[PDB]
Symmetry: D2
Subunit: 296 residues, 4 copies
C-alpha cells in the first residue's frame, strides 16, 4: 500500500526528486513512474555480461526495440531518438510512413514552429509544426542520384534492396551527425518500415521509377531480419511512441507512450497516456541518460 503524495515545493526545487515523486502523484504521473522503472530494468538487463540472424550487430543481454510514428521525427523528439541511437542504447528501430524522410530533410533545411493560407505560401502543417515545400524539393534533388546508384547496384552487383537496407544507405549518404539514420547505420542498428513509400519519399520513388525504372524493395527479407532479432534475443525490451507502430500476438519489458484510446478497438507492461513530446525526454533523462558512462 503506497500512499498518494505529491512533490512538496517547500523542499525547494530538486528536479530528480520532483520526477521521482510522479510515482506517488497518481494518474498518468504514476504510470510515468512505472515506465521509468521498466526502462531502468531494461537497461540493467542490457548491461549484464553474456559469456555466450544474418546481422553484424553483437548480441547483448537485452535487445531493445524503439518504435515511433513519423510525427515524433518531425518534432524535437528526433534529437532524443538520435541521442539514443548515437550511443547504441537501442538495438532496432521501427517507424511508420514519413518517419525516414522527416529526419533527412531536417539535415537540408529546418522545420519551424507555427500553431494549431498555408498552401499559398507552400507549407506542410503537422500539428503546430511547419515544413516549407521547398524542403521537400531540396530533398528530392539530393535523393535522385542516390536512387540512380541504387538501381545500378541492384542490377549489376546483385544487391537485393529492402526498406531497411535503403534506410541504411540514405543514413550513410546524408552523412550528418544530427540524423538519426546516419547514426543507426554507423552503429548497425537496423531500421524497419514496410510503409516507407506511403508518403513523400514514396512519391519521389514513384516519379523516379519512370525516369529510371527497375527498383525493387522486398519486404520478406526485412520480415526475416526483424523477427530473428526477437527470436534470438536473451531478453527483449520495447519502447513504443505514438501507437500504430508494432503488432502483438513475449516481450519481457514494454513501455508504450501515446494518446490513442482503446474504445474503438485501435491497436507488467506500462502505458503512459500522454503526448510523447512531453514525456519521452523526461523518461530518457531518468533512465538512459543516467547510464551514459556505461554505454561507452
Amino acid at each position: 500500500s503506497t500512499q498518494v503524495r505529491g512533490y512538496d515545493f517547500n523542499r525547494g526545487v530538486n528536479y530528480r526528486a520532483l520526477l521521482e515523486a510522479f510515482g506517488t502523484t497518481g494518474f498518468q504521473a504514476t504510470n510515468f513512474g512505472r515506465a521509468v522503472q521498466q526502462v531502468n530494468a531494461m537497461i540493467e538487463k542490457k548491461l549484464e555480461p553474456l559469456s555466450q540472424t544474418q546481422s553484424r550487430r553483437p548480441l547483448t543481454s537485452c535487445t531493445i526495440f524503439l518504435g515511433y510514428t513519423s510525427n515524433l521525427i518531425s518534432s524535437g523528439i528526433r534529437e532524443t531518438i538520435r541521442y539514443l541511437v548515437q550511443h547504441n542504447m537501442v538495438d532496432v528501430l521501427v517507424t511508420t510512413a514519413g518517419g525516414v524522410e522527416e529526419d533527412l530533410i531536417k539535415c537540408l533545411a529546418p522545420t519551424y514552429l507555427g500553431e494549431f493560407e498555408l498552401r499559398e505560401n507552400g507549407i506542410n502543417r503537422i500539428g503546430n509544426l511547419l515544413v516549407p515545400n521547398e524542403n521537400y524539393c531540396k530533398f528530392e534533388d539530393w535523393l535522385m542520384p542516390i536512387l540512380d546508384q541504387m538501381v545500378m547496384e541492384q542490377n549489376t552487383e546483385g544487391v537485393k534492396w529492402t526498406p531497411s537496407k535503403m534506410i541504411a544507405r540514405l543514413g550513410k549518404e546524408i552523412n550528418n551527425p544530427e540524423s538519426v539514420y546516419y547514426w543507426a547505420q554507423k552503429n548497425h542498428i537496423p531500421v524497419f518500415s514496410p510503409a516507407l513509400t506511403d508518403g513523400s519519399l514514396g512519391d519521389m520513388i514513384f516519379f523516379h521509377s519512370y525516369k529510371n525504372p527497375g527498383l525493387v524493395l522486398d519486404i520478406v527479407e526485412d520480415l526475416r531480419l526483424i523477427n530473428t532479432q526477437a527470436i534470438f534475443a536473451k531478453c527483449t525490451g520495447m519502447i513504443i511512441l505514438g501507437g500504430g507502430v508494432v503488432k502483438h500476438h513475449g516481450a519481457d519489458y514494454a513501455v508504450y507512450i501515446n494518446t490513442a484510446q482503446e474504445f474503438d478497438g485501435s491497436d507488467q507492461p506500462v502505458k503512459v497516456y500522454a503526448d510523447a513530446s512531453l514525456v519521452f525526454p523526461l523518461l530518457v533523462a531518468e533512465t538512459f541518460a543516467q547510464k551514459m558512462d556505461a554505454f561507452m
Copy 2:
C-alpha cells in the same frame, strides 16, 4: 444560415427524417449530415457517364478509395465493407496490418463478443475475442498456397506484390462472405504494405525457413496505387479509423475516426467510432443507389 433543430419525435419514428435531421442537430451529428452529402456527391459523380473527351478494371467518372484499419475488419463493419466491394461501389482498397487475415479467418471460424484470456488462448481486440485456434486453422489453409506462390515465382516468373498476394488469397478463400474474395472477383485492388506486420506475417516468416525465397515487391504496388489516382477523372476518399493514408487533393473526402490532432497524429471529418457511423452512412448513400450499381 441554418438553424439548430433536433428531430422531433412527436412526428413518430420516421427513420429517414431522423437521419436527415442529424444535419441540423450540431456537433458530430452535423458532420454526419455533411458526410452523407459528400458521399452522395461522389456517387452521383460516379454514375455520371464519361463524356466523349474523358475516356480511358474499367474507369468511371469517380474513382473511390476506401481505407480502413484492421480493427474494423474484426468488427461487423467487415460486412458493410464486403457489401460495397461485392457491388463494385468502390474501386480501390487500402488497409493496415491485420486487415487481410482477419477477413480470411472469419471464413474458417467466427469472432466473438466479450468485454472491455492469455491462458484459454484468446486474442482480445477491444471487446472482440478471437480464439487462438482460429489462427491455427488459418495456418493450415495458408501453407499450401504459399508453396504454390513460391513455385510460380521460381518457375513461371510471377513477381509478387502485396496486392497480388491479397488477390490470390481472396480467390483461394472462395467464399462470398469475404471482402477479399469479392475484391479480386471484381478487380478491386487491395494495397497494404504492412501486410506482413501481424499474424499472416508470422506465418510467411515461419514458412520461409521450410521453403525460402518469396519476394513481395512494394514498388510495383507503389506505381499501381498512384496511377489509380493520377488517371482518375475525379477521386473520392472514405477512410475509416486513421493511420491508413498520407497527403501532401481528393475531390470528395470523408474521414471517420477518433484520432486527436493535438499530438500531431470541403472534406469532412466525423469524430466517432466508425462501427456506429459507417453503417448509417452507407444506408443513406450507397444502399439508396444499389440498383444503379446492378
Copy 3:
C-alpha cells in the same frame, strides 16, 4: 458466445434491423446495443403497476433521472430531451452551468450552425454552433421583470427560492411548447442545477442584484429534494449525457453517453463512448419512442 456480425445490406434497408445489428457489430456499436437493452428494461419496470419527498409527482415503479451538459441543450438534442419531458418519460432532470438558459434563449431567437472574427460580429461559438450576443440581450430583457417578481415574492410571500424552484418559474414564464423547462414544470419534473449561476444566467442575476438586492438561492433544500427522490424510489434508472453531471459512491439501471476518458481520473451499467448528438436520438428511437402509446 454471440458471433460478431454486421448488418447485411443485401437485405436492403430496414432501419430497425440495422440498429438491432449494432449489438453484434462490436466496439461502441455493441455498447449502443447494450444501452438500448438497459433503457428498455428501465421503461418496462416504469410501466409495471404499483398497488402502493415534499413533492407532488406520483411515484412509479422506476424513477428515471436524466442528466445532461449545457452543450447538449445548445444542440438539437434539446428537442430530444424536450420530447421525453413533454410525455413524462423521465422523472428528474439534472444539468450543468448554462443548461437552463440555453433552452430559454432558443425560445426568443435561434441558434445557428457554423464550423469548428467572431467577437467583432457579436457571436458566442459552442463547438460548431453559433449564438449571437443579441440573443443573450433579448433574454436579459425578458428575465429582469421576472427576477423583480421573484425578489418581491421571497420577501412578502415567504417563498424560499432554490435553483429548482427558479427553473420551474422560468419554464412557466417562457410559456412555450418548444422549451424543455416549460414542459418540466407543467409535468412536475424537478430540475436540479447547483451551478445554475456559473455562466450567463449568473452574470444577469449578478447585475440584477445591484438593481434589486435581496435574492437568495438555497442549495440545501434542493439537496434534500433530489436525494429523497432517490431514497424513496422502488427502482432507479439513470441516463447521463456528456459527463461531469452527477456523482456516485444504488442505481438499478444506468446508461452513460460521453467522450470523456478515464485515464486522468475524470468522473450492469453501460457506457457508450460517443458524441451524444449522434447516439441519443437513435437510442430514443429504439426505446422511449417505441412505447409512446403506453405513456398516454
Copy 4:
C-alpha cells in the same frame, strides 16, 4: 521564426535547459513552454507594485484564479495546490463536486495507489483508492461542526454560503497539509456551488433530518467571485482539468486538461494530464519566485 529542435542529451542532464527546450520541441511540449511564459508573465505582473492611481484580502497588480477538478485533489497535485495557497501565490480558488472533502479526508486518513473493490469497501478514482472507512471518519469529524453552523445561523444570524462553509471547514481541520486550512488562513476564498453534489453533500443531507434548516446561499458567493474579477487590475487564470469555469476576458490564462472540443464540451491550452504537467509548470514559475512571496 523559431526552428524545431529537441533537447540534446549530449549536453548531459541539465534539467533547466531540458524544460526550456520543450518550447522548441513541438506539439504539447511547445504548449508547455508557452504556459511557462504565460504564468511567469502573471507572476511578474503580480509582483509589480500598484502605482499611485491603481489603489483599492489586499489587492495586488494581478489577481490569479486557480481552478481544478476534484480528481486533482485526490491526486498528489493536492500538495502542489496546497503549496501555492500556503504562500499566497494565488488569490481565489474554484473547484467542482468532491474538491473540498477529498482534501479534508486526507488529513484524517491516506489515499492509496491501486490500478486502472465494492466488497472490501473501496472507492476507485482512476488508479487511486480511498477506503470507505475514510468517509466514515470524515462523517464523525463533520457532524459536530454542522451542529455549530446551524446554531450560529439561528442564534447569531450567520448567513452561510459555500465559500464560508469551506473557510470554516479549513479552520476546523487545523492541519498544515490541507489546502483549505491555508486558504482560510490567508483569506483566499474558495468557490464551489456544487459543494453538496458528492459525499459531503450526502452527509449534510443526513444531518439535516436530525437538525434541519441549514441554508447555503449561492447568490452572495456569485457576487463575491464576480467582484474579485471586476475590481482586479489584471487577471490571471490557471484552470486544471476542465468543466470548472465559464466564459462569455482574462489577461493571462493557462488551461491544462484532456477534454476534446468535438462534442462541444494569447491564452494557452496544454492537452495533457495535469498530474504530469502542473508540477513541472510550478517548478519553472511560482517556485522560482518563492522568496518574493515571502
